[PDB]
Write a protein that binds this ligand. Sequence first.
Ligand SMILES: *[C@@H]1O[C@H](CO)[C@@H](O)[C@H](O)[C@H]1NC(C)=O
Ligand SMILES: *[C@@H]1O[C@H](CO)[C@@H](O)[C@H](O)[C@H]1NC(C)=O
Ligand SMILES: *[C@@H]1O[C@H](CO)[C@@H](O)[C@H](O)[C@H]1NC(C)=O
Ligand SMILES: *[C@@H]1O[C@H](CO)[C@@H](O)[C@H](O)[C@H]1NC(C)=O
Ligand SMILES: *[C@@H]1O[C@H](CO)[C@@H](O)[C@H](O)[C@H]1NC(C)=O
Ligand SMILES: *[C@@H]1O[C@H](CO)[C@@H](O)[C@H](O)[C@H]1NC(C)=O
Ligand SMILES: *[C@@H]1O[C@H](CO)[C@@H](O)[C@H](O)[C@H]1NC(C)=O
Ligand SMILES: *[C@@H]1O[C@H](CO)[C@@H](O)[C@H](O)[C@H]1NC(C)=O
Ligand SMILES: *[C@@H]1O[C@H](CO)[C@@H](O)[C@H](O)[C@H]1NC(C)=O
Ligand SMILES: *[C@@H]1O[C@H](CO)[C@@H](O)[C@H](O)[C@H]1NC(C)=O
Ligand SMILES: *[C@@H]1O[C@H](CO)[C@@H](O)[C@H](O)[C@H]1NC(C)=O
Ligand SMILES: *[C@@H]1O[C@H](CO)[C@@H](O)[C@H](O)[C@H]1NC(C)=O
Ligand SMILES: *[C@@H]1O[C@H](CO)[C@@H](O)[C@H](O)[C@H]1NC(C)=O
Lengths: 148, 148, 49, 99, 49, 50, 197, 49, 246
Amino acid sequence: ASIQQQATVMLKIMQDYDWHVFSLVTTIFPGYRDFISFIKTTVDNSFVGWDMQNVITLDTSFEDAKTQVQLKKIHSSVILLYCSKDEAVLILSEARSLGLTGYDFFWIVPSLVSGNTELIPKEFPSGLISVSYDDWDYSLEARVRDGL
Amino acid sequence: FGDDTDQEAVAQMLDFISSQTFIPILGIHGGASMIMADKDPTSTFFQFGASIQQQATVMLKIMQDYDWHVFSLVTTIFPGYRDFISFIKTTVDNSFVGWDMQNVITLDTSFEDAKTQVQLKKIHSSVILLYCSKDEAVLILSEARSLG
Amino acid sequence: GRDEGCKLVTIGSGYIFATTGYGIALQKGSPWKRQIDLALLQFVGDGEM
Amino acid sequence: KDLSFTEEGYQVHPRLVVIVLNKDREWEKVGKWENQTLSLRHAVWPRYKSFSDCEPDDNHLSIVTLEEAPFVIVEDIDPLTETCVRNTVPCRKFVKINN
Amino acid sequence: YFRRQVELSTMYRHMEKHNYESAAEAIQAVRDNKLHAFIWDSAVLEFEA
Amino acid sequence: EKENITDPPRGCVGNTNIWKTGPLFKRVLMSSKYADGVTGRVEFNEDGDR
Amino acid sequence: KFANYSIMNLQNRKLVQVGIYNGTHVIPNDRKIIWPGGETEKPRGYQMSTRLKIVTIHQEPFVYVKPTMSDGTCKEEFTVNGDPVKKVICTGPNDTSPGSPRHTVPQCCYGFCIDLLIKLARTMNFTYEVHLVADGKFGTQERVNNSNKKEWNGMMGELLSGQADMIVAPLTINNERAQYIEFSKPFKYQGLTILVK
Amino acid sequence: NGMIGEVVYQRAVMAVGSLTINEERSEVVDFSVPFVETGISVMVSRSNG
Amino acid sequence: KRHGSWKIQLNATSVTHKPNAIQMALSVCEDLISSQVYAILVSHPPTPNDHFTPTPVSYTAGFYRIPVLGLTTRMSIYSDKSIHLSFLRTVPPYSHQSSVWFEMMRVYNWNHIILLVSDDHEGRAAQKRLETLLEERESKAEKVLQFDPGTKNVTALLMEARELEARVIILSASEDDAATVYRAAAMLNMTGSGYVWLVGEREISGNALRYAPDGIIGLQLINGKNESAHISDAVGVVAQAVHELL
Ligand SMILES: *[C@@H]1O[C@H](CO)[C@@H](O)[C@H](O)[C@H]1NC(C)=O
Ligand SMILES: *[C@@H]1O[C@H](CO)[C@@H](O)[C@H](O)[C@H]1NC(C)=O
Ligand SMILES: *[C@@H]1O[C@H](CO)[C@@H](O)[C@H](O)[C@H]1NC(C)=O
Ligand SMILES: *[C@@H]1O[C@H](CO)[C@@H](O)[C@H](O)[C@H]1NC(C)=O
Ligand SMILES: *[C@@H]1O[C@H](CO)[C@@H](O)[C@H](O)[C@H]1NC(C)=O
Ligand SMILES: *[C@@H]1O[C@H](CO)[C@@H](O)[C@H](O)[C@H]1NC(C)=O
Ligand SMILES: *[C@@H]1O[C@H](CO)[C@@H](O)[C@H](O)[C@H]1NC(C)=O
Ligand SMILES: *[C@@H]1O[C@H](CO)[C@@H](O)[C@H](O)[C@H]1NC(C)=O
Ligand SMILES: *[C@@H]1O[C@H](CO)[C@@H](O)[C@H](O)[C@H]1NC(C)=O
Ligand SMILES: *[C@@H]1O[C@H](CO)[C@@H](O)[C@H](O)[C@H]1NC(C)=O
Ligand SMILES: *[C@@H]1O[C@H](CO)[C@@H](O)[C@H](O)[C@H]1NC(C)=O
Ligand SMILES: *[C@@H]1O[C@H](CO)[C@@H](O)[C@H](O)[C@H]1NC(C)=O
Ligand SMILES: *[C@@H]1O[C@H](CO)[C@@H](O)[C@H](O)[C@H]1NC(C)=O
């Protein structure tokens, strides 16, 4: 799927669950300016009246000094993280260390943040919301057969 | 006796002399006149100065004359601090002004510049109140100049 | 206050009636009760009610 | 299977998969997607009280009320976008099939 | 101006039925008793009164 | 001058694990401030340009 | 941290160990918890408040205060419905402290809340004593001469000092009074208005 | 039955909506402070006259 | 032995009693400054001086902010970090006994308590700790009392406590004040049934043990008077802290 359709599906999930207070946290991991811009336009397109906390942008590897301030500005419910897989592990480990993994603090990430379903790393909350398409039901042999 | 250094415990030593020699001793200058915490009725030692509550009343009178209502309070465990913070909390509880008191920044030990930097970057008020020793205040002001 | 026809001006103002209020039912011994009571008195104590 | 392509090399109708994590360290397949609309299996969202080891959650208050006109105005969801307007709150109403 | 407002969404859900093209449509509709109310600028309706 | 000195290994023989101090070395390249040069005062901006 | 302590009993000028205490847990031993009175069980020393101290303010629709007839007595008078006015021998000051120097006498109190209190005494079996408040105020969070601390005066000040037991008055139920004491459910639903001519 | 049955059998925490105050509810649950002065009344025919 | 192959060595310095506390502090500071010490241990409980003042040693060490690890006293004037700057210890004060007394409230389900303290210095800290314990349950005591020791007509306050509706008597005083209030309690019916007597360790020593009512419940330290093993634990704490600092 595209990043635009996947963001549309994630905002459709948020529409179905009415978690109107949210945030948006990104690193410099690619496909991010179009992602943030699509989210900003879709909030501007919405008559729902979403509550969007400002976009947190992470530059490089953390010293846990400025990034700690950027993570402690987060007080919303849904946290939208867009980074790599190892950076997702680092940010979730920091949020677990800073206590930012509460029951209010939801986490919705796309497939490229989560990655493969064949390997699941640590530092993941039981309830980590994600959207991917690496289905074990629709088999890989069916995928390559459809490609052929 | 008038001291030239910055040690109030000298007067505490003089307090022990007031426990032993039973001589009325007047602290004149410096650490002999620097205010200690709590005297004794068995002690006949006396200083020249005001209590920390009276100087707090003077500083809050300055803030009343200038209407600098949004303020903070940065305190270490340097002594005379529980009565000072308690006096400020009761003055906020006895306020027709409506003093916007930001919560008390606390310092346990010398700064690690890891968690103390977080407590310093929570300051968003106008008046920053500091109550500590001399070189600790020099380090905190150098940190605040470093942290902007 | 929403009547179509406006033939309804009720009997007095609750003179000879039950004269109760509306409240929030909690469990017998819930810790929320004092906080909910203080919150309701704050909501009345500023005109927001 | 409508496996058509866009101008940027993306599937027109892909298979959107919505998963979460359980306490058993497994990614549970929860929601798929139709040709246009989202398919959600769990209408009642499970709260997942234990995201981690030490999480005492005593702030999820189960609340029931009764439909009365001057206090509890209950309407259907919007037919256009399937959305409660933001000055309202969501709810669920249990409706049986027949008697 | 009613879309920026935070609580008048009921009027937005009501007026979506009869969004008219021109003001003369609304003038003729209230003239033929099709409407019951209409929101408009002041002095224009002062002239049309 | 800093710690965690790691090296990009022989990734062409059986290695797919990425170099973890990649963004660290890139941030070192970001803070490259100089006042010497025949072309002039060279320094990288937030976009990594002159 | 976590100080092990010993719980000792004095059994007729003899120290007897009757328990221990961990960092957070009390462990009683197999000894007898000997009390100076009767049994070894715990004395539930919370009396059921047989005698009560009732304080009120001079409220004309609620508390009629009238001086006695001859000496500490109340005349049994009737209403328009033939109801005997169920009075009570209240004890109160005459006027304010600049007004009256020292004159605190028992007089006759009756009216609305007195009948409410007599209905309450009909409900549960208890005794009571009706008295009045020293000043003429309900009670506010008001400054005192030192300590940088506002305390309470009026009926609340006399109740929180332990001089009273139960305020029977038009209690203006707000957020400030509820933070310190518990309340009852309101017998009267009553708002605010403006008296003009 | 109803909200009282949901709170007493503890399938809910509290009831927010309009709820009267009587003896049996105070037996089984605990009310909060009242926030609105709501008794009962009688609506009749009450014609012009 | 087990703290590694670090090249540090140790040396001892110990000073005994003198009647003149001025020359006590003089010999102390002569032995502290000329030796460049790190840790100071005060170990004199059975002093004939009834003032019980290890103050000037801790005040001399606090002149350059050197932590004295005392072993004897339990007063709030030594428990304070304001005047005594870094006078630490491994002995608990009496105020934490109130926490144990709060645990007594969790033993017998007793809520309404009455507090009687003769002192004012430790009494304010005991009142603060007890009000913290009551705030943990969000309740209050019925009556608290602080006064001036020495007099004998505090019987009227005990009769006002008789006029109250709880029988939980919590007491915090020295030996002579406890003996005075026990004599008043015996002369005013207060040693009968229903009364709740729960005190510390100052009320079971001397004549306070003599005039105590039969059936009183009190607290006692464990290894409080065993002082050699207390020295051994203190030296272990000090040595591991010094190796961790080095
Ligand atoms: C999916 O495709 C079918 C035809 O194959 C169509 O009838 C259906 O409407 C599509 N689903 C939706 C709801 O878009
Ligand atoms: C079956 O459903 C229909 C409405 O679809 C209606 O008759 C009733 O709700 C059910 N039948 C009965 C008699 O309960
Ligand atoms: C179904 O019908 C019966 C007929 O008496 C009625 O009593 C009952 O309330 C109805 N409800 C159920 C059980 O669905
Ligand atoms: C290297 O970085 C890690 C975090 O990625 C940090 O914990 C560690 O202190 C650094 N270097 C070492 C081995 O001290
Ligand atoms: C600035 O321009 C001058 C003239 O060309 C030359 O020094 C160089 O190109 C540039 N760099 C600096 C800062 O000198
Ligand atoms: C204190 O006492 C018991 C028994 O000695 C011990 O198991 C435990 O560590 C403490 N209490 C608790 C937490 O059970
Ligand atoms: C009580 O006050 C009234 C006020 O007029 C006064 O007449 C009366 O003498 C006072 N009672 C006495 C005897 O002090
Ligand atoms: C009076 O009160 C006592 C308790 O002191 C109780 O036993 C008795 O039943 C009461 N009598 C009546 C009839 O109220
Ligand atoms: C002290 O309190 C009294 C109470 O009446 C008050 O009148 C006075 O203004 C206060 N201030 C002084 C003089 O200390
Ligand atoms: C240890 O200290 C003493 C002074 O207290 C002095 O003789 C010398 O520094 C050392 N001597 C011994 C006994 O090792
Ligand atoms: C202390 O004072 C009172 C004052 O009346 C007096 O009766 C007695 O001497 C003492 N207390 C007692 C035992 O009543
Ligand atoms: C209480 O003490 C008095 C003496 O003041 C004595 O006469 C009386 O018998 C005692 N009562 C009890 C309950 O023993
Ligand atoms: C103190 O405790 C230790 C613990 O082993 C014990 O050996 C010793 O006998 C006790 N008392 C003395 C005499 O030090």
